[PDB]
Amino acid sequence: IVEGSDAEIGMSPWQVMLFRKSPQELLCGASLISDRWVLTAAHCLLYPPWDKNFTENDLLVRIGKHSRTRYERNIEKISMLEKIYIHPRYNWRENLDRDIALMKLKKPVAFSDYIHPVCLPDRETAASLLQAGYKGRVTGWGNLKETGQPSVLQVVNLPIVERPVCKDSTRIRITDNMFCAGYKPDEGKRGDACEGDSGGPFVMKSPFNNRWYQMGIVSWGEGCDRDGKYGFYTHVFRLKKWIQKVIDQFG
């Protein structure tokens, strides 16, 4: 996260770290959506241009974390993966369209003060909140700048951007399965996700029921926090039917 701040303890209890077994390193962010399911970006698991194609046994999920590097004894919980599900129409070839994956844990994780699932949006909540100017929150342990790394989980609040501005900021083809967020050059404030934040959640707190909803998944951006560029997020609600089909079929 670029230009963010240290998270408060328990501020993002659904935050998940995807962790490579060997070498031991941060792979990506992710989120907890129930006691057995974790949501992330497909490109965290499959990305042929970088020779990335992880299998279940390559990875661990670490939940309840604050410190990036420490083993947080008695706080974090580490889970093995039963199965990875990548969207069948995930477009790694072109523009990361439908950049979404689910991971089922081998055993359920115990909720605690530091571990708790985020809500997924219904159509109504999505329609109410996914509006230009409305701010969401992005969290992760990714790099602090484009070209170092944080001691603890970072947080930044960012405004959703008008689709035409999103489209005009890039030569990449934008789809309805993406939205973008970030400040414009003129707005003074800044901030963005960066390398290593991929797969983490973009959340909004509903003013209707005071619950946190994951509206987006950190997906892509040209650089990190560049003037005139924006962060692009997987549109979680637009892909909810697939999410439900997977959980219903393999739950």
């Binding site: 077994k21 031991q24 390193e25 941060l26 661990l60 590097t69 083993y71 580490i78 093995m80």
Partner: peptide
């Protein structure tokens, strides 16, 4: 630069 995790998670 990551602290080693309990071996049981790697087994």
């Amino acid at each position: 630069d990551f602290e080693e995790i309990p071996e049981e998670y790697l087994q």
